[PDB]
């Protein structure tokens, strides 16, 4: 597959070898403020990262992903929309050329510069792979990025990226906390939906935070220097790796806040 966000390959043209592209819970979407309901069978979100091994960084040709230990529960999500129990496998961002755009989710048609998604996968299928196969097979918890103060808990994968330019890349990125790219609040709206990018499974529960957290210019500007080319291949900056808001069909955003 050469599925990509370039003008030939771009989300438009998945639905070709992808026809679940066009299915009936496809993410991300618009989340309109005024129509989520609080839902009170909501039980306690909980973030257990305190015991997150981080391992290694990977430039894939589409996103960087910073990948964990996940042969063991060391940084799990529970609680909230979730059943049982579900590993962190790996992080990555989707972002802008510009900070007018960048986001996959919306808010009220509001974009943002950048949108973080923290993939988790339910314990229950054993390994990831089962798990895509699933309905409830992910967790994903998205976060919003804005434009602002830098992030200081991002800082030490912003300076590894000089190192992963490059698709195929990767660095040794152990002991990273991935608790320092959290907003104070945890508040947050979920609803059934799928992978962002090929193959577009619909395997994931979103929980995207209301509040986004806030990194720098030069944070965001560092981000837009990577490649989604190979080595020594014709330089195509890695910017606009996010796919547009799909239709919400028959389902319900719900908010864990009242
Ligand atoms: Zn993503």
Same mark, same amino acid.
Not at 17 to 39: L, M
């Given at each position: 597959?050469?599925?990509?966000?370039?003008?030939?390959?771009?989300?438009?043209?998945?639905?070709?070898?992808?026809?679940?592209?066009? !299915?009936?819970?496809?993410?991300? @979407?618009?989340?309109?403020?005024?129509? #989520?309901?609080?839902?009170?069978? &909501? %039980?306690?979100? $909980?973030?257990?990262?305190?015991?997150?091994?981080?391992?290694?960084?990977?430039?894939?040709?589409?996103?960087?992903?910073?990948?964990?230990?996940?042969?063991?529960?060391?940084?799990?999500?529970?609680?909230?929309?979730?059943?049982?129990?579900?590993?962190?496998?790996?992080?990555?961002?989707h972002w802008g050329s510009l900070?007018?755009?960048?986001?996959?989710?919306?808010?009220?048609?509001?974009?943002?510069?950048?949108?973080?998604?923290?993939?988790?996968?339910?314990?229950?299928? !054993?390994?990831?792979?089962?798990? @895509?196969?699933?309905?409830?097979?992910? #967790?994903?918890?998205?976060?919003? &990025? %804005?434009?602002? $103060?830098?992030?200081?808990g991002l800082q030490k994968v912003?300076?590894?990226?000089?190192?992963?330019?490059?698709?195929?890349?990767?660095?040794?990125?152990?002991?990273?906390?991935?608790?320092?790219?959290?907003?104070?609040?945890?508040?947050?709206?979920?609803?059934?939906?799928?992978?962002?990018?090929?193959?577009?499974?619909?395997?994931?529960?979103?929980?995207?935070?209301?509040?986004?957290?806030?990194?720098?210019?030069?944070?965001?500007?560092?981000?837009?220097?990577?490649?989604?080319?190979?080595?020594?291949?014709?330089?195509?900056?890695?910017?606009?790796?996010?796919?547009?808001?799909?239709? &919400? %069909?028959?389902?319900?955003?719900?908010?864990?806040?009242?």
């Amino acid at each position: 597959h050469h599925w990509g966000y370039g003008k030939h390959n771009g989300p438009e043209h998945w639905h070709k070898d992808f026809p679940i592209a066009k !299915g009936e819970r496809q993410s991300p @979407v618009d989340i309109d403020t005024h129509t #989520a309901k609080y839902d009170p069978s &909501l %039980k306690p979100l $909980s973030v257990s990262y305190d015991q997150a091994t981080s391992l290694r960084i990977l430039n894939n040709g589409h996103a960087f992903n910073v990948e964990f230990d996940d042969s063991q529960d060391k940084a799990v999500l529970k609680g909230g929309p979730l059943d049982g129990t579900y590993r962190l496998i790996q992080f990555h961002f989707h972002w802008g050329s510009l900070d007018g755009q960048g986001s996959e989710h919306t808010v009220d048609k509001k974009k943002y510069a950048a949108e973080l998604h923290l993939v988790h996968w339910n314990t229950k299928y !054993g390994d990831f792979g089962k798990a @895509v196969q699933q309905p409830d097979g992910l #967790a994903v918890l998205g976060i919003f &990025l %804005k434009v602002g $103060s830098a992030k200081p808990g991002l800082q030490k994968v912003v300076d590894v990226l000089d190192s992963i330019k490059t698709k195929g890349k990767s660095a040794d990125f152990t002991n990273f906390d991935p608790r320092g790219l959290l907003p104070e609040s945890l508040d947050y709206w979920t609803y059934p939906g799928s992978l962002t990018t090929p193959p577009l499974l619909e395997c994931v529960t979103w929980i995207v935070l209301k509040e986004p957290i806030s990194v720098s210019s030069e944070q965001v500007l560092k981000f837009r220097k990577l490649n989604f080319n190979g080595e020594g291949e014709p330089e195509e900056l890695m910017v606009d790796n996010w796919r547009p808001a799909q239709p &919400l %069909k028959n389902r319900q955003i719900k908010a864990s806040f009242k």
